């Protein structure tokens, strides 16, 4: 046990100098919960496997503090002086501190970060989002309703032309948003430049035919940084402003890719695809961090949007509690975790305008105009994975909002009447939800929705 | 179940067009192993939760193939046409395919990659290492023995000057190698530029006093790529060539940072620190991929070295089996995984010179000069975590080689007589091992080793 | 100072009258505040107090004399946040405002950096 | 009296986060030495002539501390968290904190900095 990291009940951890975190910890045979907590606090801040002999009073003043313990639920509260984190809003460094070596410690059998708190003084040091769902809505000229999008399937194997065709068919069917599948890139059979050019041409045709703008999120994840920047610059040169978003495989490409795109292209929607996060977040893995934590850090890094899950309605792991908590972490000015209440404002909570905005948000009013110096911009939850027209309404009911992007892959492209019909089916299912008519009743005179009922049941 | 992805016994999977992988898979109750295998192969190549209606004959020719099943051990062999992977040797794209969304599938309760195979035709497409341990040996003018290094502790909180002092004390005590702790960067109290200048001055003093060269591995993990490049360029401007290495938090910063440093500074040792890998690799996490896999991909990306574990001797989770297998994956020309035999050569196995080199390696001879067009350069295992002078000999005995870097934090800086004494103690423990004298007997007239024995027992 | 001596020296160039023209207030004194505490606010908190003072009818805000580029109150962010706060006040009231920035620095190049920014 | 700046005997002043200073202080008639010390510590760090209502817990953690008093010799030992000083090694900013407004307070009759750590 390293007692130098144990200060149970210390009231100074709430003074704005500390980022707080809750771990579910369980050490090997012989270690108590507080012992495991002291060792984790040591390995996630200033120490190592034994008391550090070269420590100075200063470095000891920057120690992480285990300040609360719950033995029954194997919970531990640790406080991190965020001064120890790399400056310049380095988020990968935060994850290195709190989600780094502690996951490999042989003496820790369970190590799951369940919640984290960012004090306003800490929020000051980080980017936060810059282009929001509201900006995309402005470009698309669609208000209030969810943004309806698709993932082009198959995940890999189409040529650039076939890919642009599926884009055209989806948009032309009333769809608003198309994203690359996360691994689609510069494969020889699907040249990336030609993919961009064909997407542009297809978008021009849809805009001509319908008078409506559309949006495509391009995957720019690459081998190195030079290639990603090359792809992004090409897209900028080929697509009209607001008509394109930048998708990054955040987990496998890394937080640095996210922050770099956020800072280099602040006026472009940054689409944080989280392929691989399961190893961190899945309930079955006792070591890692949960999806709410991932989402809060993705907002901290500045992602315009991140996938937050379908609350168990689709095919990816999750329940209404965690996934809806994630969507609220992304959207709300005041969001509640399992253990910390978060206000996404760099201003003291006592401010009258802030409390007013919080009250107005509880009443349904927008806080986005509250002041660039006063809020962390909202981030967009992206709802994907096993969705089809039959499930969108259930999701809307579960999350309690319509401020999000849904993306459907096989839920659109496997529709018996084709992609265009699949997009029409999702729009008709949304109308069914909006008019409070059952999908069976509404589909009586909607052929596309009726076929979606046939295939997806 | 998606039958289009099951081709058990397909003899075309060994023809060099496919990267092979073994998963330990467990689906939810009601799903058979081949069912879970079909769904995993679908979500990791061309498909989704249901057969894709927009699929083409071409794209179906690029499907992943489940070609072998082991019901008893819940094992599944999948073949991925590496043509579907992003070009330019993109490793993050591979990891998105095979270790991405499949980790979030609600219907899969266990999904652990246990081994992977690279055919020569695939190896051609990737960087592999460029700066090796042999290059560092040349610079340090130390042959045969392990490279002895330290991690400066405390993990955070020292000023740039105090940090340089500990560097000086370790080097002056006979240590060869000093690395940043993984989160140390540009904290306000430890300015990065001043830290670099002080390291150069300390190194100059050691070289003056000893006539010996030294190496310091700097952490360049940053918020964005421009800051990392700024740090790298500064270090190049302040340190003599060969005297510095670049450390990157591969997991939290991302594979793109790794590949970018490899390609932009190929003549500098790339130190892949794997802070955070545990959530993927720990035995307790049923979802992820193992350490041998992580290491093989780190060699694919071109890391000069990666942490491979202490075989259970230290404090990080691991056994002799997996950790020694990882070190051999990093070092050898012919390395054995749990399920695949890997030859790190882009040349046909039948080649006489290649088989000769494999035999000569079995006899203890170096293959590094075999030809730049026919080998993937060797990668260096880095041995860290809870190590102290008492354990180094046991590690050398377990791994069966000396081509590695050991790094010790508290094993040096918590030594009762200080850092310089700790470095001398590790050197004396190595001398004890080399002469087949027990540490107990050797410490009789070696004061530093004697105090290390008393403190670390 | 005799008149022949005064010729050799600068004298002021920007006066209170120039600021009056910008502020569009005549006769009455210019009412301003020093953001307090003297040190310890983040750039956001600092801009919040600037907004609150201007919105209440104040014309002029000045840095406290030691406020600068402390790590917890980034100078560049402080400037941007003050700009946005002033923008909001101007939209809500239709009145212009003034902020006096402390450019006192360690050396001359840093002061010029701050001023140009 | 601004009591928030009085923490006599605080042992955390020796942890390296603070620059230390000794003043010879004498306030006007009616103010004790610890009174003059409270006002000087306030005006040389985070406060003013009265408690700052807009202060945050963060900002109060950066308060200067009068941690020692010598009544007989009119001496006061104050600790300044050097994190409040402008970065880039700004020395004029230190002198602005500790040798600035405190020299103009009407209520301080003697205010002499004698040593610093
Ligand atoms: O590859 C896929 O499965 C998807 O394209 C969905 O396809 P379908 O519409 O065919 O289901 C999305 O990337 C996942 O939803 C991501 O998971 P998450 O949202 O949890 O990040
Ligand atoms: O932070 C640490 O624990 C270390 O600096 C070791 O310090 P000590 O010498 O004080 O133990 C290493 O980074 C870890 O060993 C990395 O783990 P791995 O090698 O498994 O990647
Ligand atoms: Mg996808
Ligand atoms: Mg370390
Ligand atoms: Mg030959
Ligand atoms: Mg206010
Ligand atoms: Mg003042």
How far is D89 from B444, CA to CA, in rounded Å?
51
Residue linked to tokens 């985070």: D46
Location of structure tokens 């720990």:
B282
Helices within A47-116 (DSSP H only): 57-61, 91-98
Q: How far is A397 from chain B (nearest CA, A)?
A: 21
Dihedral over Cα of B86, B88, B90, B94: its sign: positive
User: Residue C68 phi/psi, 5° resolution?
Assistant: -155, -125
CB A149 within 8 A of CB A179: yes
A-D C-beta contacts closer than 8 Å = 28
Nearest by Cα to A381 from A409, A406, A410, A398? A406
3-class secondary structure per residue, D40-102? HHHHCCCCCCCCCCCCCHHHHHCCCEEEEEECCCCEEEEEEEHHHCCCCCCHHHHHHHHCCHH
Helices A160-172 and A192-210: crossing angle, nearest 10°?
A: 20
Tell me the C-alpha distance between A269 and A254, whole Å: 18
**Type and span of the H or E element at D109:** strand D108-116
In terms of CA atoms, which chain C residue is nearest residue D99?
Answer: C66
d(CA A168, CA B302): 40
Residue B287 main-chain phi, psi, to 5 deg: -115, 130
Output the CA angle B42-B48-B49, nearest 5 degrees: 105
Any chains having at least 3 CB pairs less than 8 A from chain A are B, C, D
Is B109 one of the catalytic residues?
no
Whether B170 contacts B162, CB under 8 Å: no
Among B59, B107, B279, select the one facing A280 at the smallest CB separation: B279
Say yes or no: D88 contacts chain A, CB-CB below 8 A. no
Mutate which of A41, A48, A93, A105 for ligand 2? The one with the most ligand atoms within 8 Å of its CB, which is A48
Of B135, B166, B141, B117, give the one whose Cα is nearest residue B15.
Answer: B117
Q: Which helix or strand (DSSP H or E) is residue A244 part of?
A: strand A244-249
Angle of helix C75-93 relative to helix C43-55, nearest 10 degrees, comes to 20
D97 touches chain C (CB under 8 A): yes
d(CA A131, CA A304): 6
Which of B311, B409, B413, when mutated, tests ligand 2's pocket best, judged by the most ligand atoms within 8 Å of its CB?
B409
Q: D19 and D79 in contact (C-beta within 8 Å)?
A: yes
What CA dihedral angle connects A104, A106, A107 and A109, to 10 degrees? 70
* Gap between the terminal Cα atoms of chain A: 56
Residue of chain C nearest A127, judged by CA positions: C77
Beta-bridge partners for B77: B22, B68
**Residue C116's CB: how many other CB atoms inside 10 A?**
7
- Please tell me if the CB atom of residue A251 comes closer than 6 angstroms to any atom of ligand 1: no
Tell me the DSSP string of A318-380.
Answer: --HHHHHHHHHHHH-SEEE-SS-EEE--SS-TT-HHHHHHHHHHHTT---TTS-TTT-PPP-E
Q: Say how many C-beta atoms besides its own lie within 10 A of residue B339's C-beta.
A: 16
What is the distance, to the nearest Å, from the Cα of residue A383 to the centroid of all Cα atoms in its chain? Answer: 10
Whether A251 and B252 have beta carbons less than 8 Å apart is answered as: no
Ligand number nearest CA of A104 is 2
Give the strand pairing for A65-70 and B65-70. Answer: unpaired
Q: Which atom of ligand 2 is nearest to the CA of B385?
A: 15
Point out which residues pair with D79 in neighbouring strands: D20, D65
3-state secondary structure of A124: coil
Q: Best interface-test mutation with A: which of C41, C42, C76 has the largest number of A CBs within 10 A? A: C42
> In terms of DSSP bridges, do strands A108-117 and A18-27 run parallel, antiparallel, or are they unpaired?
antiparallel
DSSP A3: G
> Do residues B287 and A288 make contact, with C-beta atoms less than 8 angstroms apart?
no
Asked whether B67 and B9 are in contact (CB, 8 A), the reply is yes
Q: Comparing C-alpha atoms, which of A110, A120, A127, A91 is closest to residue A294? A: A91
Q: How many CA atoms lie less than 13 Å away from A107 in the CB half-sphere?
A: 19
Q: What is the DSSP letter of A307?
A: E
Length of chain A measured in residues: 457
Q: For chain D, what's the residue count?
A: 117
Residue nearest to atom 17 of ligand 1 (CA): A385
How many whole angstroms separate alpha carbon B363 and alpha carbon B397?
A: 18
What is the C-alpha to C-alpha distance for residues B86 and B180, in angstroms, rounded to an integer? Answer: 33
β-bridge mates for residue B24, sequence order: B75, B112
Alpha-carbon span D101 to D93, nearest angstrom: 12
Beta-strand relationship, B108-117 and B18-27? antiparallel
To the nearest 10°, report the CA torsion of A289, A293, A297, A299: 150
What is the 8-class DSSP label of residue A105? B
Q: Within chain A, how many helices (H) and strands (E) appear?
A: 19, 15
**Chain-chain contact of A255 with B254 (C-beta, under 8 angstroms):** yes
Count CA atoms within 13 Å of residue D11 on its CB side: 1
Helix/strand/coil for A273: strand
DSSP type of residue D5: G
Closest-CA residue of chain D to C34: D48
Is D50 within 8 Å of chain A by CB? no
**Mutation target vs C (from A86, A266, A373; most C CBs, 10 A cutoff):** A373
The set of residues, in sequence order, having a beta carbon less than 8 Å from that of C12 and lying 6+ positions away, is none
Residue B431 and residue B423: Cα distance in Å, rounded? 13
Mutate to test the pocket of ligand 1, among A384, A395, A407, A423 (most ligand atoms within 8 A of CB): A384
Distance B340 CA to ligand 2 centre (A): 29
Query: D50: which 2 tokens?
Result: 């009265």
A250 Cβ below 6 A of ligand 1:
no
- Reading the block at residue A229, the tokens are 């920047």
B436 exposure class (CB count in 10 Å sphere: 0-12, 13-18, 19+): exposed
Instruction: For residue A406, give the nearest of A421, A420, A419, A393 by alpha carbon.
Output: A393
Residues found in chain C: 117
Strand partners, A216: A178, A244
Lay out the sheet containing D75-81: strands in order across: D65-70, D75-81, D18-27, D108-116
Cβ(B174)–Cβ(B150) below 8 Å: no
The 3-state DSSP class for residue A32 equals coil
Q: Which residues of B touch A180 (CB under 8 A)?
A: none
Would you call B328 an interface residue with chain A, using a CB distance cutoff of 8 Å?
no
B420 catalytic residue (yes or no)? no
Q: Which two tokens stand for residue A53?
A: 């002999």
∠ CA B422-B426-B432 to the nearest 5 degrees? 140
Whether C71 sits inside 8 A of D85 (CB atoms) is no
Q: D115 φ, ψ to 5°?
A: -170, 155
User: Residue A274 in 3-state DSSP?
Assistant: coil
> How far, in Å, CA of B107 to CA of B30, rounded?
10
Inter-helix orientation angle A419-434/A392-399, to 10°: 40
Token code pair at residue B257? 């940072």
* Closest ligand 2 atom, residue B407 Cα: 9
* CA A334 – CA A357 distance, rounded (Å): 9
Cβ distance of B158 and A280 shorter than 8 Å:
no
How far is the C-alpha of A41 from the C-alpha of A108, rounded, in Å?
Answer: 12
Residue A201: Cβ within 10 Å count: 15
Q: How far is the CA of C26 from the centre of ligand 7 (A)?
A: 26
A119 in contact with chain C, both atoms CB, cutoff 8 A: no
**CA within 13 Å, CB half, B367:** 26
d(CA A60, CA A62): 5
| Rama region for B122: left / alpha / beta (φ>0; ψ in -120 to 50; rest) | alpha
CB A242 within 8 A of CB A216: no
Q: Print the SS3 string covering chain B.
A: CCHHHECCCCHHHHCCCEEEEEEEEEECCCCCHHHHHHHHHHHCCCCCCCCCCCCCHHHHHCCCEEEEEECCCCEEEEEEEHHHCCCCCCHHHHHHHHCCHHHHECCEEEEEEEEEECCHHHHCCCCCCCCCHHHHHHHHCCCCCCEEEEECCCCCCCCHHHHHHHHHHHHHCCCCEEECCCCCCCCCCCCHHHHHHHHHHHHHHHHHHHCCCCEEEEECCCCCHHHHHHHHHHHHHHCCCCCEEEEEEHHHHCHHHHHHHHHHCCCCEEEEECCCCHHHHCCCCCEEECHHHHHHHHHHHCCCEEECCCCCCCCECCCHHHHHHHHHHHHCCEEECCCCEEECCCCCCCCHHHHHHHHHHHCCCCCCCCCCCCCCCCCEEEEECCCCCCCHHHHHHHHCCCCCEEEECHHHHCCCCCHHHHHHHHHHHHHHHHCCCCHHHHHHHCHHHHHHHHHHC
Method: X-ray
Nearest CA to ligand 2 atom 4: B385
Residues of A annotated as catalytic are: 153, 273
Given an 8 Å threshold on Cβ–Cβ distance, is C37 in contact with D46?
Answer: yes
Q: How far is the CA of B385 from the centre of ligand 2 (A)?
A: 4
Distance in Å from the first CA to the final CA of chain D? 26
Of B193, B177, B197, which is closest to residue B185 (Cα–Cα)? B193
In chain A, which among 139-158 make CB contacts under 8 A with chain C? none
Question: Crossing angle, helix A192-210 and helix A225-238, to 10 degrees?
Answer: 30
* Beta bridge partners of residue A117, listed in sequence order: A20
Residue A277 CB contacts under 8 Å (≥ 6 apart), including other chains: A250, A251, A291, A294, B103, B104
Distances (CA, A) of B177 to B149, B254, B404, B424, B451: 4, 25, 12, 13, 23
- At CA A240, angle to CA A239 and CA A246, rounded to 5? 55
Residue with tokens 């309703």: A145
Hey, of C44, C53, C92, which one would you mutate to test binding to chain A, going by the most A CBs within 10 A of its CB? C44
CB A256 within 8 A of CB B223: yes
Helical packing angle, B160-172 and B419-434, nearest 10°: 30
Q: Give contacts of D56 with chain A, Cβ < 8 Å.
A: 16, 121, 348
Cα-based distances in Å from B391 to B142, B308, B310, B432, B438: 21, 16, 9, 12, 12
- With both helix axes pointing from N to C terminus, report the angle between A255-264 and B225-238 in degrees, rounded to the nearest 10: 100
CA–CA gap between residue C62 and residue B321 (Å, rounded): 67
| Interior/surface letters D15-38, b for 16+ CB within 10 angstroms, e for the rest | eebbbbbbbebebeeebebbbbbb
Polymer length of chain B: 457
Q: Is D20 on the interface with C (CB under 8 A)?
A: no
CB B407 within 8 A of CB B426: no
CA end-to-end distance (rounded Å), chain B: 56
Is there a contact between A82 and A307 (Cβ–Cβ < 8 Å)? Answer: no
The CA distance from C55 to C87, in Å, is 11
The reply to whether A60 touches chain D by the CB within 8 Å rule is yes
| Phi and psi, residue A154, nearest 5° | -65, 155
Which residue lies with its CA nearest to atom 17 of ligand 2?
Answer: B385
* Ligand 2, atom 2: closest residue by C-alpha: B385
Which residues, in sequence order, are CB contacts of D72 under 8 Å at separation 6+?
none
Long-range contacts of D100-105 (CB under 8 A, 24+ apart): D100/C65, D100/C66, D100/D44, D101/C65, D101/D43, D101/D44, D102/D40, D102/D43, D102/D44, D105/D39, D105/D40, D105/D43
Beta strands in chain C (DSSP E): 32-34, 60-62, 98-100
Residue A384 Cβ inside 6 Å of ligand 1? The answer reads yes
Task: Using the mean position of ligand 4's atoms as its centre, give its distance from the Cα of residue B114 in Å.
Answer: 26
Query: SS3 for A106?
Result: coil
**Token reading at B17:** 């067009």
Q: A422 CB less than 6 Å from ligand 1? A: no
In angstroms, the CA A53 to CA B451 distance is: 14
D76 DSSP β-pair partners: D23, D69
- D56 Cβ under 8 Å from any chain A Cβ: yes
Element (H, E) at A271: strand A270-273
A91-98 and A291-301 are packed helices; what angle lies between their axes, rounded to 10 degrees? 150
| Residue C88 CA to its chain's centroid (Å) | 16
The subunits that touch chain B, with at least 3 C-beta pairs less than 8 Å apart, are: A
Distances (CA, A) of B403 to B242, B425, B430, B449: 18, 20, 14, 23
How far does the centroid of ligand 6 lie from the alpha carbon of residue C34, in Å? Answer: 16
Residue A310's alpha-carbon distances to A307, A316, A412, A453, in angstroms, are 9, 7, 16, 19
- Left, alpha or beta for D63 (phi > 0: left; psi -120 to 50: alpha)? beta
**How many Cα neighbours within 13 Å face the side chain of A64?**
33
What separation in angstroms does the CA of A241 have from each of A199, A237, B259, D59?
14, 9, 30, 43
CA distances from A48 to A1, B44, B67, B156, B385 (A): 11, 38, 46, 11, 9
The response to whether residue A410 sits with its C-beta less than 6 Å from ligand 1 reads yes
Of D16, D17, D56, the CB nearest to A16: D56
Spatial distance between the Cα atoms of A274 and A304, rounded to a whole number of angstroms: 13
Contact residues of ligand 2, CB 6 A cut-off: A 48-49, 101, 104; B 151, 153, 155, 181-182, 274, 307, 309, 315-316, 384-387, 408-411
């Amino acid at each position: 046990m390293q007692k130098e990291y144990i200060q149970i009940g210390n009231p100074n951890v709430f003074n704005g100098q500390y980022m707080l975190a809750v771990f579910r910890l369980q050490g090997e045979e012989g270690m108590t919960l507080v012992d495991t907590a002291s060792e984790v606090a040591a390995e996630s801040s200033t120490g190592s496997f034994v008391k550090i002999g070269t420590a100075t009073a200063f470095s000891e003043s920057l120690d992480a503090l285990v300040y609360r313990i719950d033995e029954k639920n194997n919970l531990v509260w640790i406080a991190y002086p965020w001064r120890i984190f790399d400056r310049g809003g380095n988020v990968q460094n935060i994850m290195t501190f709190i989600a780094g070596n502690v996951f490999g410690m042989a003496s820790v059998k369970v190590c799951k970060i369940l919640d984290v708190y960012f004090p306003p003084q800490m929020l000051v040091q980080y980017d936060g989002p810059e282009y929001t769902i509201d900006d995309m809505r402005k470009y698309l000229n669609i208000q209030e309703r969810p943004i309806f999008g698709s993932i082009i399937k198959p995940k890999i194997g189409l040529t650039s032309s076939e890919y642009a065709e599926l884009c055209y068919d989806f948009w032309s069917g009333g769809g608003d948003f198309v994203k690359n599948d996360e691994p689609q890139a510069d494969q020889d059979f699907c040249p990336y430049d030609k993919m961009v050019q064909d997407v542009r041409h297809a978008m021009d045709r849809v805009e001509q035919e319908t008078g409506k703008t559309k949006v495509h999120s391009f995957n720019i994840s690459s081998s190195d940084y030079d290639t990603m920047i090359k792809k992004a610059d090409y897209i900028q040169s080929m697509m009209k402003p607001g008509s394109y978003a930048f998708l990054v495989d955040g987990i496998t490409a890394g937080w640095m890719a996210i922050q770099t795109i956020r800072r280099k292209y602040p006026n472009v929607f940054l689409h944080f695809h989280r392929a691989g996060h399961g190893a961190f977040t899945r309930d079955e893995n006792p070591i890692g961090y949960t999806v709410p934590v991932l989402t809060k850090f993705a907002r901290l890094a500045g992602a315009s949007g991140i996938h937050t899950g379908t609350a168990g309605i689709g095919k990816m792991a999750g329940s209404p509690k965690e996934d809806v908590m994630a969507a609220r972490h992304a959207l709300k000015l005041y969001s509640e975790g399992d253990y910390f209440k978060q206000i996404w404002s760099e201003i003291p909570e006592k401010d009258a305008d802030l409390q007013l905005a919080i009250q107005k948000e509880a009443e349904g009013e927008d806080y986005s105009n509250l002041g660039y110096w006063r809020i962390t911009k909202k981030m967009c939850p992206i709802i994907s994975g096993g969705l089809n027209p039959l499930l969108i309404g259930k999701f809307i009911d579960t999350v309690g909002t319509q401020d999000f992007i849904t993306t459907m892959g096989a839920g659109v492209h496997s529709h018996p009447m084709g992609t265009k019909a699949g997009a029409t089916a999702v729009l008709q299912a949304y109308e069914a939800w909006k008019q409070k008519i059952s999908l069976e009743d509404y589909a009586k005179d909607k052929e596309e929705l009726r076929a979606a009922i046939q295939f997806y049941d």
